[PDB]
PDB file of C-alpha atoms in Angstrom:
ATOM      1  CA  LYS A   1     -16.834  32.571 -24.141  1.00 10.94           C
ATOM      2  CA  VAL A   2     -13.377  32.256 -22.585  1.00 12.46           C
ATOM      3  CA  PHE A   3     -11.149  34.951 -24.142  1.00 12.99           C
ATOM      4  CA  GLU A   4      -7.495  34.425 -24.892  1.00 11.82           C
ATOM      5  CA  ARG A   5      -5.300  37.112 -23.250  1.00 12.52           C
ATOM      6  CA  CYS A   6      -4.358  39.381 -26.203  1.00 13.37           C
ATOM      7  CA  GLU A   7      -7.775  38.892 -27.821  1.00 10.25           C
ATOM      8  CA  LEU A   8      -9.353  40.352 -24.701  1.00 10.90           C
ATOM      9  CA  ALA A   9      -6.795  43.192 -24.496  1.00 11.73           C
ATOM     10  CA  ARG A  10      -7.675  44.378 -28.010  1.00 11.14           C
ATOM     11  CA  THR A  11     -11.398  43.792 -27.412  1.00 11.50           C
ATOM     12  CA  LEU A  12     -11.284  46.031 -24.321  1.00  7.60           C
ATOM     13  CA  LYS A  13      -9.150  48.661 -26.055  1.00  5.06           C
ATOM     14  CA  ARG A  14     -11.617  48.858 -28.917  1.00  4.70           C
ATOM     15  CA  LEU A  15     -14.364  49.365 -26.328  1.00  2.75           C
ATOM     16  CA  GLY A  16     -12.588  52.424 -24.912  1.00  2.21           C
ATOM     17  CA  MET A  17     -11.209  50.946 -21.689  1.00  2.00           C
ATOM     18  CA  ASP A  18      -7.604  52.061 -21.987  1.00  2.00           C
ATOM     19  CA  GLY A  19      -7.253  54.854 -19.451  1.00  2.00           C
ATOM     20  CA  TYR A  20     -10.975  55.038 -18.709  1.00  2.00           C
ATOM     21  CA  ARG A  21     -11.114  57.197 -15.535  1.00  2.00           C
ATOM     22  CA  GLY A  22      -7.357  56.769 -15.237  1.00  2.00           C
ATOM     23  CA  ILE A  23      -7.340  52.971 -15.336  1.00  3.42           C
ATOM     24  CA  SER A  24      -4.874  51.352 -17.735  1.00  2.31           C
ATOM     25  CA  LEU A  25      -5.781  48.367 -19.949  1.00  2.00           C
ATOM     26  CA  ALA A  26      -3.333  46.202 -17.973  1.00  2.00           C
ATOM     27  CA  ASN A  27      -5.336  46.881 -14.813  1.00  2.00           C
ATOM     28  CA  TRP A  28      -8.607  45.865 -16.474  1.00  2.60           C
ATOM     29  CA  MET A  29      -6.895  42.697 -17.777  1.00  6.61           C
ATOM     30  CA  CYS A  30      -5.585  41.835 -14.299  1.00  7.42           C
ATOM     31  CA  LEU A  31      -9.099  42.408 -12.944  1.00  4.71           C
ATOM     32  CA  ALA A  32     -10.712  40.131 -15.582  1.00  8.59           C
ATOM     33  CA  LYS A  33      -8.079  37.436 -15.119  1.00  8.83           C
ATOM     34  CA  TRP A  34      -8.521  37.246 -11.392  1.00  8.32           C
ATOM     35  CA  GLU A  35     -12.282  37.656 -11.415  1.00  6.98           C
ATOM     36  CA  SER A  36     -13.260  35.057 -14.030  1.00  4.15           C
ATOM     37  CA  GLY A  37     -10.205  33.757 -15.886  1.00  6.45           C
ATOM     38  CA  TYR A  38     -11.544  35.766 -18.860  1.00  5.64           C
ATOM     39  CA  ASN A  39     -14.808  33.744 -18.841  1.00  5.06           C
ATOM     40  CA  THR A  40     -17.982  35.682 -19.779  1.00  6.01           C
ATOM     41  CA  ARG A  41     -20.330  33.082 -18.256  1.00  2.00           C
ATOM     42  CA  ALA A  42     -18.566  32.869 -14.886  1.00  2.00           C
ATOM     43  CA  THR A  43     -21.032  33.100 -11.996  1.00  2.00           C
ATOM     44  CA  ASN A  44     -20.618  33.026  -8.257  1.00  2.00           C
ATOM     45  CA  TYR A  45     -23.323  32.820  -5.639  1.00  2.00           C
ATOM     46  CA  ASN A  46     -22.814  34.526  -2.259  1.00  2.00           C
ATOM     47  CA  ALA A  47     -25.021  32.683   0.235  1.00  2.00           C
ATOM     48  CA  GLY A  48     -24.216  35.272   2.906  1.00  2.00           C
ATOM     49  CA  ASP A  49     -26.161  38.099   1.262  1.00  2.00           C
ATOM     50  CA  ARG A  50     -28.008  36.135  -1.429  1.00  2.00           C
ATOM     51  CA  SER A  51     -26.406  37.986  -4.315  1.00  2.00           C
ATOM     52  CA  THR A  52     -24.638  36.716  -7.427  1.00  2.00           C
ATOM     53  CA  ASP A  53     -21.537  37.967  -9.284  1.00  2.00           C
ATOM     54  CA  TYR A  54     -21.882  37.803 -13.085  1.00  2.00           C
ATOM     55  CA  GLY A  55     -19.614  37.577 -16.086  1.00  2.00           C
ATOM     56  CA  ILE A  56     -16.070  38.449 -17.010  1.00  2.00           C
ATOM     57  CA  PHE A  57     -15.784  41.181 -14.296  1.00  2.00           C
ATOM     58  CA  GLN A  58     -17.933  39.345 -11.756  1.00  2.00           C
ATOM     59  CA  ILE A  59     -20.307  42.303 -11.303  1.00  4.27           C
ATOM     60  CA  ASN A  60     -22.628  41.922  -8.267  1.00  2.00           C
ATOM     61  CA  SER A  61     -26.457  41.815  -8.462  1.00  2.00           C
ATOM     62  CA  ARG A  62     -27.063  43.640  -5.157  1.00  2.00           C
ATOM     63  CA  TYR A  63     -26.031  46.901  -6.744  1.00  2.00           C
ATOM     64  CA  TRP A  64     -25.343  46.738 -10.466  1.00  2.00           C
ATOM     65  CA  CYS A  65     -27.676  44.554 -12.463  1.00  2.00           C
ATOM     66  CA  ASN A  66     -31.120  43.109 -11.998  1.00  2.00           C
ATOM     67  CA  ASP A  67     -31.757  39.336 -11.651  1.00  2.00           C
ATOM     68  CA  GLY A  68     -35.055  39.600  -9.757  1.00  2.00           C
ATOM     69  CA  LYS A  69     -33.960  37.114  -7.092  1.00  2.00           C
ATOM     70  CA  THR A  70     -31.605  39.322  -5.013  1.00  2.00           C
ATOM     71  CA  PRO A  71     -33.304  40.712  -1.846  1.00  2.00           C
ATOM     72  CA  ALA A  72     -33.570  44.522  -1.749  1.00  2.00           C
ATOM     73  CA  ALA A  73     -31.142  44.970  -4.651  1.00  2.16           C
ATOM     74  CA  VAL A  74     -30.713  47.917  -7.004  1.00  2.00           C
ATOM     75  CA  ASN A  75     -29.734  48.073 -10.702  1.00  2.00           C
ATOM     76  CA  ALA A  76     -27.215  50.899 -11.154  1.00  2.00           C
ATOM     77  CA  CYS A  77     -26.146  49.743 -14.650  1.00  6.58           C
ATOM     78  CA  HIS A  78     -29.778  49.428 -15.758  1.00  6.37           C
ATOM     79  CA  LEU A  79     -29.172  45.964 -17.226  1.00  7.09           C
ATOM     80  CA  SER A  80     -30.560  42.491 -16.761  1.00  4.25           C
ATOM     81  CA  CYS A  81     -27.778  40.423 -15.179  1.00  5.83           C
ATOM     82  CA  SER A  82     -28.277  38.223 -18.275  1.00  7.43           C
ATOM     83  CA  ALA A  83     -26.561  40.987 -20.337  1.00  9.76           C
ATOM     84  CA  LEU A  84     -23.454  40.246 -18.255  1.00  7.73           C
ATOM     85  CA  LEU A  85     -23.356  36.643 -19.481  1.00  9.56           C
ATOM     86  CA  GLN A  86     -23.093  37.384 -23.238  1.00  9.74           C
ATOM     87  CA  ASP A  87     -20.126  36.382 -25.432  1.00 11.58           C
ATOM     88  CA  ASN A  88     -20.081  39.994 -26.586  1.00 10.21           C
ATOM     89  CA  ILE A  89     -18.752  42.084 -23.684  1.00 13.65           C
ATOM     90  CA  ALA A  90     -19.962  45.562 -24.747  1.00 12.75           C
ATOM     91  CA  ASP A  91     -22.687  45.655 -22.061  1.00  9.02           C
ATOM     92  CA  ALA A  92     -20.385  44.298 -19.337  1.00  7.13           C
ATOM     93  CA  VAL A  93     -17.836  46.971 -20.269  1.00  5.28           C
ATOM     94  CA  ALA A  94     -20.503  49.721 -20.097  1.00  5.05           C
ATOM     95  CA  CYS A  95     -21.427  48.408 -16.640  1.00  3.89           C
ATOM     96  CA  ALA A  96     -17.759  48.120 -15.539  1.00  2.40           C
ATOM     97  CA  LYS A  97     -17.314  51.736 -16.647  1.00  3.71           C
ATOM     98  CA  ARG A  98     -20.323  52.695 -14.497  1.00  3.72           C
ATOM     99  CA  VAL A  99     -18.847  50.926 -11.486  1.00  3.98           C
ATOM    100  CA  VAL A 100     -15.583  52.912 -11.738  1.00  2.00           C
ATOM    101  CA  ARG A 101     -17.283  56.300 -12.075  1.00  2.81           C
ATOM    102  CA  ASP A 102     -18.036  55.941  -8.311  1.00  3.85           C
ATOM    103  CA  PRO A 103     -15.595  57.160  -5.561  1.00  3.08           C
ATOM    104  CA  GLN A 104     -13.573  53.925  -5.300  1.00  4.52           C
ATOM    105  CA  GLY A 105     -12.812  53.652  -8.989  1.00  2.85           C
ATOM    106  CA  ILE A 106     -10.987  50.396  -9.784  1.00  2.00           C
ATOM    107  CA  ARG A 107     -10.836  49.638  -6.035  1.00  2.00           C
ATOM    108  CA  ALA A 108     -14.503  48.588  -6.171  1.00  2.00           C
ATOM    109  CA  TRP A 109     -13.290  45.019  -6.761  1.00  2.00           C
ATOM    110  CA  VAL A 110     -11.689  43.410  -3.724  1.00  2.00           C
ATOM    111  CA  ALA A 111      -9.834  41.028  -6.097  1.00  2.00           C
ATOM    112  CA  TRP A 112      -8.165  43.998  -7.831  1.00  2.00           C
ATOM    113  CA  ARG A 113      -6.934  45.234  -4.440  1.00  2.00           C
ATOM    114  CA  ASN A 114      -5.764  41.706  -3.514  1.00  2.00           C
ATOM    115  CA  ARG A 115      -3.947  40.763  -6.752  1.00  2.00           C
ATOM    116  CA  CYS A 116      -3.441  43.844  -8.948  1.00  2.00           C
ATOM    117  CA  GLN A 117      -2.983  46.901  -6.750  1.00  2.00           C
ATOM    118  CA  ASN A 118       0.699  47.841  -6.512  1.00  2.00           C
ATOM    119  CA  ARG A 119       1.673  44.788  -8.493  1.00  2.00           C
ATOM    120  CA  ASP A 120       3.613  44.617 -11.754  1.00  2.00           C
ATOM    121  CA  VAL A 121       0.780  44.076 -14.290  1.00  2.00           C
ATOM    122  CA  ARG A 122       2.789  44.736 -17.493  1.00  2.00           C
ATOM    123  CA  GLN A 123       2.619  41.029 -18.267  1.00  2.00           C
ATOM    124  CA  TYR A 124      -1.120  41.200 -18.984  1.00  2.00           C
ATOM    125  CA  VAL A 125      -0.761  43.341 -22.125  1.00  2.00           C
ATOM    126  CA  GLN A 126       2.746  42.576 -23.385  1.00  2.00           C
ATOM    127  CA  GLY A 127       2.737  41.336 -26.955  1.00  2.00           C
ATOM    128  CA  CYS A 128      -0.924  42.231 -27.591  1.00  2.00           C
ATOM    129  CA  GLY A 129      -0.239  45.343 -29.657  1.00  2.00           C
ATOM    130  CA  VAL A 130      -2.178  47.680 -27.414  1.00  2.00           C
TER     131      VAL A 130
END
């Protein structure tokens, strides 16, 4: 599923993402936009370390979910990477929440640092009623 902007904003807010560990909804939206264009089935293979990024937040299989094919990987979210390719994003959100409980918080995603950190991200939630 490819979410429309405001649809995703409300979906995430209903899932308890607004201000989760200090991260505003707008930041999560900016992260989703730059990671997958709001596409839940987005996938990216990294030939360098043989891992794959899955779903709307492009969560990596080396550390967060299990896909069986990633060499010496762990499964911190205790999910099959398949759960990160569902139209319903509840599992992906639970996993994204797990990622940010770690030291780096929202900085875990290089894309957030590249295109959201210290940027004006108001535009991602304006008009969505959140």
